[PDB]
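User: Modeling request: complex.
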Amino acid sequence: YPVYQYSGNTSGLNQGRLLFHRDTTYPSKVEAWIPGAKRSLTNQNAAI
Amino acid sequence: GRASQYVAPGTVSSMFSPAAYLTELYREARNLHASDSVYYLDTRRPDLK
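Assistant: Request completed. Predicted assembly structure:
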């Protein structure tokens, strides 16, 4: 369940954060592939 | 990862299993007699441990 948080607007962030909720109980990582940008963010060793 | 690992309703890995029961019984029972006593549990049944 992703939400993108913008830098600024009272919360300066270093380049912004892609927030997400996940249901899995496994200690994995989450890839967020963005095909048009040909960019992908990854949360390595993401929290449950 | 204990809180992510749920077990079958009757398996050796379960806390409510007879293995778990055995584990508790031994852990406590073993100290009922002195280690140098002829009646010491481990002496009587070393295969148990």
